[PDB]
Amino acid sequence: SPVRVGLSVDASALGHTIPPDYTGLSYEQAQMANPNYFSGANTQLAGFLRTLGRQGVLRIGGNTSEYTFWNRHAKPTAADEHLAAGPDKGHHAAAREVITPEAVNNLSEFLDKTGWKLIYGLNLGKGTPENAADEAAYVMETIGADRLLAFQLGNEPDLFYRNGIRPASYDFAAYAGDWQRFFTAIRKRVPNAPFAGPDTAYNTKWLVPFADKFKHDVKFISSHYYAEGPPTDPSMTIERLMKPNPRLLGETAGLKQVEADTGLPFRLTETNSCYQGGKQGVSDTFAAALWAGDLMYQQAAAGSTGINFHGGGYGWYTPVAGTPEDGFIARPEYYGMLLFAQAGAGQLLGAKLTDNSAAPLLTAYALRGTDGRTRIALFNKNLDADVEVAISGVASPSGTVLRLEAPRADDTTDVTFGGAPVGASGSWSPLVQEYVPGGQFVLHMRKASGALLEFA
Numbered sequence: 001s002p003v004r005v006g007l008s009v010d011a012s013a014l015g016h017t018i019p020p021d022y023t024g025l026s027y028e029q030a031q032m033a034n035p036n037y038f039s040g041a042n043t044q045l046a047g048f049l050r051t052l053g054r055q056g057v058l059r060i061g062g063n064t065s066e067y068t069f070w071n072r073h074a075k076p077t078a079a080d081e082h083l084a085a086g087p088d089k090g091h092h093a094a095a096r097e098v099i100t101p102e103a104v105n106n107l108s109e110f111l112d113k114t115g116w117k118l119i120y121g122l123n124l125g126k127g128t129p130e131n132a133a134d135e136a137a138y139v140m141e142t143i144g145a146d147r148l149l150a151f152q153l154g155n156e157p158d159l160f161y162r163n164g165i166r167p168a169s170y171d172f173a174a175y176a177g178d179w180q181r182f183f184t185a186i187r188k189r190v191p192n193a194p195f196a197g198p199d200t201a202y203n204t205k206w207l208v209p210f211a212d213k214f215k216h217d218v219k220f221i222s223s224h225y226y227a228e229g230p231p232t233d234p235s236m237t238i239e240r241l242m243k244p245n246p247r248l249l250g251e252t253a254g255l256k257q258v259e260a261d262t263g264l265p266f267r268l269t270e271t272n273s274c275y276q277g278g279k280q281g282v283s284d285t286f287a288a289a290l291w292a293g294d295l296m297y298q299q300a301a302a303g304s305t306g307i308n309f310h311g312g313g314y315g316w317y318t319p320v321a322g323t324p325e326d327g328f329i330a331r332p333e334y335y336g337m338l339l340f341a342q343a344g345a346g347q348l349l350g351a352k353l354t355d356n357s358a359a360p361l362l363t364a365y366a367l368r369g370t371d372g373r374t375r376i377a378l379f380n381k382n383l384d385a386d387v388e389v390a391i392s393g394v395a396s397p398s399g400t401v402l403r404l405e406a407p408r409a410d411d412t413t414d415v416t417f418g419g420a421p422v423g424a425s426g427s428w429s430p431l432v433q434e435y436v437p438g439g440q441f442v443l444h445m446r447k448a449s450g451a452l453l454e455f456a
């Protein structure tokens, strides 16, 4: 009983070109206490990253970046060698952790195995400028300028107070003075050090003035986004997660204006569904795959340079869960990122939906792939409506579909893409071949499902 909608692809309606390093992940800086985690020996986690993209960015930072201390003198402890640092829950101070040379050496090997680039947090909330300069120098020495994309000087400095790291009076002017002291110290040790900031959610009292003041000193603007609003908000449900988020649209417009004003591109350096490490029954469900895959394309269409989904440990919202000792597994959100991975890079095209007011949470994105083939990514985020999509504007002898599926929107497991789960070490191949019947094509999609179409 599907809602019958039209999708019109326009090869002449050119959007943004998706860069090859758009995808990415974000982790807590505390995880650097364990030299076995980001290590060339961690072949399982490296494989999960390679399946998400041949290029991509690993961001290390988060709330734990204010509680983590580089020590050039130190060696990892026995406890460090088993630490699994999941997303910080933001209720109280994180434990103090130490980063060692060995952990940085191992990170460099992990980046070589994955092919990903690095955004590395430095400790401006509690550390010293001179120790930041020393840490930056060792990271540059060992990771190298080609793989290091940016240092960041503090995570979410607008929330230092709420987290008890600065007094209530801390404001942009105070942070700018700290940023400049750190920047100057680091550039004495590392004259080519690249920076990004301010590593927080778009706002008018921090991110806009940061860009104006530091536009010649950073390579790009770094923003955060959680779909969950303030603690007072109508609480996050799956139903709400599938709906447009007007705050996201406004903050994105704000970042585009900053780019117009300053020349600085923007990257979403930390995002996930719900804050405080996620919400059980929302963040760890198949709805999060639909949400994440759709977000990747929404932000790419808006001109973002990339994204980094926060995670680690066994956090509710982590894309990849696990440890070196116990192994790693793809959680539901991973599968939305995997659909984006399989689509590949290229230039976005016009893809207009009609007759869709009874299926309003269906989204669609059309792509001219770098290999010249047209792809369409569809997210049927309607929880109660199947759709039948009449596709016009594509001329091809053959279309195939890979489906992103689970039996219920709130499933924590049972998620497949292309008729297969992801296996060990990120192993994935499609197991189900489905042609799209065809001028025009007609695609059915179940309620709460996704699809990737590829045309020959």
Ligand SMILES: O=C(O)[C@H]1CNC[C@@H](O)[C@@H]1O
Binding pocket: 028, 061, 062, 063, 064, 087, 088, 089, 090, 155, 156, 270, 274, 275, 276, 277, 278, 310
């Ligand atoms: O609250 C969250 O879930 C995240 C918010 N941004 C900072 C992260 O350390 C934290 O884990």
